[PDB]
């Protein structure tokens, strides 16, 4: 799995279920899975049929190698600095219309805060997730 090239591959296979062509919405899942974000202007600026080849080029063309999960840290220098209580933080999650179920969010908690602390901050979620890849 060495560098990113072989790690982007493993991902495409999964999100398409080893399909030559991936689903449009599943490609949006796939880009999110590497800390890549787009505007409606760039979102419309995407092909009809999406293959593996394009994805690899796209990943190189996008994915910030310095900070992969910058969009987690982008929530200014007060919210990222302050700790959010486990339950109150999940309130924000469910409110922002999350797709993750009870188990999925528990899985996430088991990855983010594995010491089972009374509270959790954002700069920590990103740091764990960069070591997750």
């Amino acid at each position: 799995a060495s560098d990113m090239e072989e790690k982007f591959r493993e991902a495409f296979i999964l999100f398409s279920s080893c399909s030559d062509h991936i689903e449009m919405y599943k490609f949006f899942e796939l880009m999110n899975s590497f800390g890549i974000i787009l505007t409606n202007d760039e979102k419309a600026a995407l092909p009809n049929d999406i293959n593996m080849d394009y994805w690899l080029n796209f990943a190189k063309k996008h994915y910030n190698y310095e900070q992969p999960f910058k969009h987690i840290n982008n929530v200014n220098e007060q919210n990222t600095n302050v700790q959010i209580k486990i339950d109150n933080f999940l309130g924000i999650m469910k409110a922002l219309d999350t797709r993750l179920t009870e188990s999925d969010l528990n899985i996430l908690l088991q990855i983010t805060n594995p010491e089972n602390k009374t509270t959790l901050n954002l700069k920590t979620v990103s740091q764990k997730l960069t070591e997750s890849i």
Binding site: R9, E10, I13, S17, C18, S19, D20
Partner: protein, 133 residues
Amino acid sequence: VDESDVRIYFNEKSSGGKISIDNASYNARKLGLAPSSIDEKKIKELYGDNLTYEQYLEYLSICVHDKDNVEELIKMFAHFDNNCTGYLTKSQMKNILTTWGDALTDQEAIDALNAFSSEDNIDYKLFCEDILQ
């Protein structure tokens, strides 16, 4: 198991009496045994890189894998058969075998796929059945 073949296959690829794990796999695959990286890493922690005939026999016993069958080996292929036909394309099958574990190379996988059947659409069950013989 053939006692005559074991002694013959050892002497054929031995160096200064001892044998390298790499030769011991080739010799196991000559008998009809399938040693994997898990079988290799177990024998390596014990007697280093080079092993004598006695240490070599205890290696061939791990290569046996009696619990092996079609239903046991298809588990990864079945995880990717969402259409529920019992069939995967040669393209689909090749990527599975290249990405994870004892990562076979593209042409190692491609040739092994054609050696089974000329057809693109391959039944993973009949395939395991064939390669296990």
